[PDB]
């Protein structure tokens, strides 16, 4: 009667029931026999690993632990009683999709199942089927242009840096300021600093040419200045961490330019942002500015970045799973019994 929606990120699992306004379960995507919060709080006994890297599932045994924990411990549901919508990264290898499907049907015995591209779900959450999504999380960043619900694979851009790299970079530059953040626990402290105090400058040079206190657990009060905006500037200038890639604005432009001439206008007018790393204050206005500088003046640029965007992917899934037009799209246990794992490529597009 009620669909489950799970968005498995590199850093956080977002899970819940279709219809809700937010994933009721949000917890670290880590396994230690111990998953999530339970796993972290017992850091001292187990070895903690992330089973998803850069948005791709790489440790299947631990991923199975994640899903099991999600159904039984977090949501407290029996998997068998709910259609389950899962998410995947842009350009996820086919074999991974099939393995996800196989696990869902054979290990968890779901009555029905679907897998959707994350960025497509955030676009959907905004009530659109055409537009270009900047989706940035803990592990990977993508520009994903979409026309009528189909991501355009030839025009997808991946930027191999996201929230975790930003946190590492703030550790670096704060250390240069005289402090020292090096270990994993210190990395968590710095992540908190990033989420509370960083922002994106409208004009980076002007900002530089022009500060907050943060109290550490040990009681020391440190001061953060230009680091606040230098950390997320890396998104616009990846050479800050030695990356040769163009910034998110430039890759948005390049992605659009790889698309059919007559859809470009529609991509420029429907630029959606989603994911934890798009939460910086000033990022929407900065992208507006940069895209405007890159685009022809004959173009209306609009950036859709709602307050709940950290969770837009999950929210998209939740909306989609409840639509009448979607119900014929579920992979049923019957269809999987008749076609095996490869049914995923036929049904989920």
């Amino acid at each position: 009667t009620t669909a489950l929606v799970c968005d498995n990120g590199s850093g956080l699992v977002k899970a819940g029931f279709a219809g809700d306004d937010a994933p009721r379960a949000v917890f670290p995507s880590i396994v230690g026999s111990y998953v999530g919060d339970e796993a972290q709080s017992k850091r001292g006994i187990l070895t903690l690993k992330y089973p998803i890297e850069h948005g791709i599932i790489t440790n299947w045994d631990d991923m199975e632990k994640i899903w099991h924990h999600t159904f039984y411990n977090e949501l407290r549901v029996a998997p068998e009683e709910h259609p389950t919508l899962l998410t995947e990264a842009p350009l996820n290898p086919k074999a991974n999709r099939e393995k996800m499907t196989q696990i869902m049907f054979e290990t968890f015995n779901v009555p029905a199942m679907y897998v959707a591209i994350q960025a497509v779900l955030s676009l959907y959450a905004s009530g659109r089927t055409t537009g270009i999504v900047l989706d940035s999380g803990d592990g990977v960043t993508h520009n994903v242009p979409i026309y009528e619900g189909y991501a355009l694979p030839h025009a997808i851009m991946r930027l191999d840096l996201a929230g975790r790299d930003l946190t590492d970079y703030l550790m670096k530059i704060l250390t240069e300021r005289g402090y020292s953040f090096v270990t994993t626990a210190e990395r968590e402290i710095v992540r908190d600093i990033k989420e509370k105090l960083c922002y994106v400058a409208l004009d980076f040079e002007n900002e530089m040419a022009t500060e907050k206190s943060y109290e550490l657990p040990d009681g020391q009060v440190i001061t953060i200045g230009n680091e606040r905006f230098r950390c997320p500037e890396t998104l616009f200038q990846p050479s800050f961490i030695g990356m040769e890639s163009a910034g998110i604005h430039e890759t948005t432009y390049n992605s659009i330019m790889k698309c059919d001439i007559d859809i470009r206008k529609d991509l420029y007018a429907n630029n959606v942002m989603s994911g934890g790393t798009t939460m910086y204050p000033g990022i929407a206005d900065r992208m507006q500015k940069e895209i405007t500088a890159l685009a022809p003046s004959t173009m209306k640029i609009k950036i859709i970045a709602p307050p709940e965007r950290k969770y837009s992917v999950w929210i998209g899934g939740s909306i989609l799973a409840s639509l009448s037009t979607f119900q014929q799209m579920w992979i049923t246990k019957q269809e999987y019994d008749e076609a095996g794992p490869s049914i995923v490529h036929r049904k989920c597009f």
Binding site: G19, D20, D21, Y124, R128, Y147, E148, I315, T325, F349
Partner: peptide, 30 residues
Amino acid sequence: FKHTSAALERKISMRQSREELIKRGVLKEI
């Protein structure tokens, strides 16, 4: 979370075939 579901439902209703989009040059594999 539901304030866009009507619009979306309408848009998905008249969603074009992958094949049609490949025919008209919009859809291409990497």
